[PDB]
């Protein structure tokens, strides 16, 4: 029993974290086989983060401009190239701890684990959702850049996020492992701000199903709704519209609990309109949107507490 934000075990990623220094700037990098990936802003001067030209800054560097440290061992850089907002540094040693891995680009609403690192040293792990506005609600201090986000399936690490910067509201922005930013953000100091966010409806529904699996039904009702009628309410409460594709995704959870998706939508409509009346669901006084249907299936029992 229980239901917590649960991260993946971080050991396979810990063995990949290194420190990269260029000039006076140090940050984290990710060492897989004979390549080290890191944010390209490692080459950026202090006095000009307002308007860097990365092509012009990088052509002025040699391989020995970069210092890469794996623990207390120096890795010699033998090549370098820019890919989007990442640098790829070729090193003279293949990481003997490289796990089976893939690079994936994750979609808004999907979750991943973050290994927060400083100076190439892992410091903590936590689970995050990619918000609809393409930010994450992380916990990062100066020098956390280059920390990565990932999911693990059958001992294969799917890397999906590298941290680049903090926005004015204290939330975080970064790229996939091809160096393409999530959202409309850029790697320079500008006035950019996160856009308005929205609540991830599919995840709220998944979490209400988790509550039923774990034995709680207090918030159900005798009503149903049409998709369109629910979406009229969702707009009023800044929830994402529900689509037929999202209804289909909830099929297995609906089958395990015997609660039709549109019947759960009617329960959610009532909770939005009337509130929770001082009660809790899975220990929470608010509706939670940072668990996906997959996360619920991963964590909950496959047998409902009827």
Ligand X SMILES: CC(C)(C)c1ccc(N(C(=O)c2c[nH]cn2)[C@@H](C(=O)NC2CCCC2)c2cccnc2)cc1
Residues that bind ligand X (CB under 6 A): 25, 27, 41, 44, 49, 140-145, 165-166, 187-189
Instruction: Answer whether 202's CB lies under 8 Å from 293's CB.
Output: yes
Residue 241 CA to residue 221 CA, distance in Å, equals: 21
Q: How far apart are CA 93 and CA 285, in angstroms?
A: 51
C-beta separation of 89 from 38 below 8 A? yes
- Whichever of 59 and 286 has its CB closer to a second copy, that residue is 286
Q: Is 1 among the residues that bind a second copy (CB under 8 A)?
A: yes
CB 152 within 8 A of CB 131: no
Rule CB under 8 A: say whether 14 interacts with a second copy. yes
The verdict on whether 41 is a catalytic residue reads: yes
C-beta closer to ligand X: residue 44 or 86:
44
Q: Which is nearer to a second copy, 43 or 289 (CB)?
A: 289
* Of 16, 22, 145, 160, catalytic: 145
Main-chain dihedrals φ then ψ at residue 66, nearest 5 degrees: -105, 130
Name the catalytic one among 22, 29, 38, 41: 41
The answer to whether 143 is a known catalytic residue is: yes
Q: Decide whether 116 or 264 has the Cβ nearer to a second copy.
A: 116
Does residue 29 carry a catalytic annotation? Answer: no
Residue 22 bridge partners (DSSP): 25, 66
The yes or no reply on residue 184 touching a second copy (CB under 8 A) is no
Question: Residue 284 carries which DSSP code?
Answer: B
Dist. CA 108–CA 122, nearest whole Å = 26
Residues forming the active site: 41, 143, 145
**Where do contacts with a second copy occur on this chain (CB under 8 A)?**
1-12, 14-15, 115-116, 122-126, 137-142, 166, 170-172, 214, 283, 285-286, 299, 301
């Amino acid at each position: 029993s229980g239901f917590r934000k649960m991260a993946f075990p971080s050991g396979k990623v810990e063995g990949c974290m290194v420190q990269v220094t260029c000039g006076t700037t140090t940050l984290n990098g990710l060492w897989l086989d004979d390549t080290v990936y890191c944010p390209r802003h490692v080459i950026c001067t202090a006095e000009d983060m307002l308007n860097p030209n990365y092509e012009d800054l990088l052509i002025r560097k040699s391989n020995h401009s970069f210092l890469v440290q794996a623990g207390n061992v120096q890795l010699r850089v033998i090549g370098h190239s820019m890919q989007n907002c990442l640098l790829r540094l070729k090193v003279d040693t293949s990481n003997p701890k490289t796990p089976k891995y893939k690079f994936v680009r994750i979609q808004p609403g999907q979750t991943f684990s973050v290994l927060a690192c400083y100076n190439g040293s892992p410091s903590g792990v936590y689970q995050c959702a990619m918000r609809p506005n393409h930010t994450i609600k992380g916990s990062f201090l100066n020098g956390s850049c280059g920390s990565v986000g990932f999911n693990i399936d059958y001992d294969c690490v799917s890397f999906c996020y590298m941290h680049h910067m903090e926005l004015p509201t204290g939330v975080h922005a970064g790229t996939d492992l091809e160096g393409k930013f999530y959202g409309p953000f850029v790697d320079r100091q500008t006035a950019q701000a996160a856009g308005t966010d929205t609540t991830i409806t599919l995840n709220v529904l998944a979490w209400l199903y988790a509550a039923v699996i774990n034995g709680d039904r207090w918030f159900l009702n005798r009503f149903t709704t049409t998709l369109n009628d629910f979406n009229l309410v969702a707009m009023k409460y800044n929830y994402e519209p529900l689509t037929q594709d999202h209804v289909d995704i909830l099929g297995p959870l609906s089958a395990q609990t015997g609660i039709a998706v549109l019947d759960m939508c009617a329960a959610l409509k009532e909770l939005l309109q009337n509130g929770m009346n001082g009660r809790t669901i899975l220990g929470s006084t608010i509706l939670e949107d940072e668990f996906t249907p997959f996360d619920v299936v991963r964590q909950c029992s496959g047998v409902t507490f009827q």
